[PDB]
Amino acid sequence: GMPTETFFNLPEEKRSRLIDVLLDEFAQNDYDSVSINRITERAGIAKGSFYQYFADKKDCYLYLIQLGIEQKTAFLRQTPPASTTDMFAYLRWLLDVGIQFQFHNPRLAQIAYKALYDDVPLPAETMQVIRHGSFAYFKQLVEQGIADGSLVPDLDADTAAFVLNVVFTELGNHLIERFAVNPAELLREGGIVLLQPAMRRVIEQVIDILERGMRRR
Ligand SMILES: [Cl-]
Question: 136 alpha carbon to ligand 1 midpoint, in Å?
C-alpha cells in the first residue's frame, strides 16, 4: 500500500522530522526488530498515531525503499557523466558514484543494503531489482566487452559479473571501516569528503585489479 494522504498533507517541518526518525530506526535495526513505539517517542508524536500515516510497517518500509531508489537515480543523473569509451574507465566512474551516493545518503543506503540479506517484505518486482538488478547490468557490460574483443575471449560473463557485483556492493563499507575514525559524526557533519584522496587510490587500485584480470592480453 501507499502512505496515507494525512502523511503527505503534514507540514514540511513535521514530515521531515518523522522521515529522519524512520530512516534512523530502519537503518539501525533489522525489519523484525523495528519498534513503532520507539518511532512515535523519538518523533515526538502521540502513541498509536503511526497508523494515521502508514497502514502498517510494510507500507512504511516500501516507502523508504522507493525513496532510496528515486534518490539514487536522481543522484546518478545530476552527477557529471564520464567522458570515456573504455569499460574500466566507466566502471571507475560508476564505482565512485555508488560510493558518493552512500556517503551523502548513509541511512537510505544502509536500508537498501540490509534488503540484500534480511527477510524483508518487498514485492517480487522490487525484490528482483534490489537483489539482481546490478548483477544483470554488469553481465550485460561484460558480454559487450567480450563481443568487441576488449576482454579475455574465454571469460565467463556470469562469473565476472559476480566479482564486479560483490566489489561494488562492499567497497563503500570497507572504505569507512578503514579510513573513518568515528563514522557516525563524520557522516552527519559531512566531513567524510576530507578522506577522498586516500579513498580514491583504493578505488583506482580496485579497478586496476579487475582490469588486469579481465582485459585481453
Ligand atoms: Cl539517508
Answer: 26
